[model samples]
Target: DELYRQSLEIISRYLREQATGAKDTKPMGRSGATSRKALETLRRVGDGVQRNHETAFQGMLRKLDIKNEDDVKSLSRVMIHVFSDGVTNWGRIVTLISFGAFVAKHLKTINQESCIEPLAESITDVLVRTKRDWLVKQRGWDGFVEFFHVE
Candidate 1:
């Protein structure tokens, strides 16, 4: 918790400095590496949060009883699909409006420890909810859900 908190502070300050500095002579925005790096760091932190979510979900699945090898295979495929593509690369498909909303939401929730925890939660929660609907409640997949689909 301490580490996460500290990291959040550093990153937050760095981001604020960058943003403030970017406000140019007329209160407009400037463009350069500082802003770029800050955004990249934010993305990396987002990735970390998503990774943790995947870890937690995998641990959960590993502990569950499975009657056959096919069940395990299906689970693996699902995880790969979800994490590899869904959480990571799927943003390219998101519209600018939704993307802005996503970034706004992520930025709003980021703290030292969380670092895009909300984004991670979005991915993980969707996975969990989908699984519950499929495995627990016998509901079919609502649509063609693309996931990370790891190998």
Candidate 2:
């Protein structure tokens, strides 16, 4: 709980600093080393989060009334509240998981209906891959969760 609270504060401040034009901001490209590294970390984190909390995350979605496309869209609207100032490449990873889960939950198609889990994973994979260069350039890693901060 404490760590979660601290993370929230850190991310919040990071976003604010970026919005107000922090001098550390730098550009990232698609195949840049920085973005490639960040994507690797995102994939690892996604795998771990899903492995550990798949059940709980599913349950949380149900609890939050996030079982449909509309609900997902509604929730997406408030993403800014979490990082109103601005967000970075690392932040995009967080959003991808949440967004992918919702997309999986509400999937309605003949060809893509049976494998929501894999579908969501694939979505994240493609997203991070394609957006890597852009994010690396635009967001530049700073508050990225490379490791848990020692508190």
Candidate 3:
């Protein structure tokens, strides 16, 4: 970790519970309110891509599991292949992340909240590792914001 990082990581770090706030909450302050909007935007747009994006987004879910860090490692390899090679678009990036919401959702049911942090961290790692230049061009996560709409 460094002195600072993108709001994307901040956004990614809490994918598990972010969407729920968007669904129901009473003015969860500024940062919470902003982050809540971004997360659900990723989730909704990512869900939108499932039906048409050329990649196997839905299929990725079949093998996604957070029973242990071992599973996270295995999926880490899988994610590199997808994020690094499959394709790069705002929709796909959104897919890379918003899918983590589903994982976080699953973890809560299985009582595995601890893994959620690492899961998002690893997801953040792979995206920056493989796509930093493009992500920078897209203004890190802000590009995603504009892609879905304004700040």
Candidate 4:
């Protein structure tokens, strides 16, 4: 829990920032590394497979409706479904983050902002635990920037 709380903080902030910053097109929005990687992954690979995942993910979203913060505890079950649903890669990773951003906007829109911190835990757990190896292989954020940054 404590180990990747750094990622958790980044996760929560990106989701919140993007609830407003959702549409920058080209600017990169000056966001943090994890979510900046997520947006680029959305851009680079999202043309086909990304929206395909969104279509597939909508099945889950249709079933989701938060009654309160406790209801967001249900979110982890959804998160588990997300990461485990198929092959793991930067593409799938960003899909989850993108969806999370949507959900952040979701909760805030309905006034359930209290749950985002836990939502961040779900993201950090999925990425830092399940995908920890590749993240380490990429030298964490540095590798992400190296691979995706266009300048």
Clash number for every model? 13, 6, 0, 0
Candidate RMSDs in Å, in order, are: 17.7, 14.0, 4.3, 4.9
After superposing candidate 2 on the true structure, give the runs of residues whose Cα lies further than 4 Å from its correct spot. 1-31, 64-69, 77-151
Question: After superposition, which runs of candidate 3 have C-alpha atoms over 4 Å from their true positions?
Answer: 1-4, 18-37, 47-59
TM-score (all chains, Cα) for each model: 0.19, 0.38, 0.70, 0.70
Q: Could you tell me how far off, in angstroms, the CA of residue 80 lies in candidate 4 after the best superposition? A: 1.4
* Model 1 per-residue lDDT tens digits across residues 63-112: 53333433333444444354444332333312211222233333443422
Per residue, candidate 3 scores C-alpha lDDT tens digits across 1-151 of 3202454445444465543333443443335544556665765675565445434544556556458667866777877876788568886777777667666666666777677777777788887788877877876555666679744
Is 1 or 4 the stronger prediction by TM-score? 4
What candidate 1 gets wrong by more than 4 Å, as runs, is 1-28, 54-151
* Candidate 2 TM-score over all chains jointly: 0.38
Better of 2 and 3 by TM-score: 3
Best by lDDT: 4
Worst 10 residues of 3 by lDDT: 1-10
Q: Give the clashing residue pairs of candidate 2, or none.
A: 27-137, 28-136, 28-137, 28-138, 29-133, 30-133
Tally clashing residue pairs in candidate 2: 6
User: What lDDT score is found at residue 40 in candidate 3?
Assistant: 58
Report the Cα lDDT for residue 139, model 2: 41
Comparing candidate 1 with candidate 3, which one achieves the higher TM-score?
Answer: 3
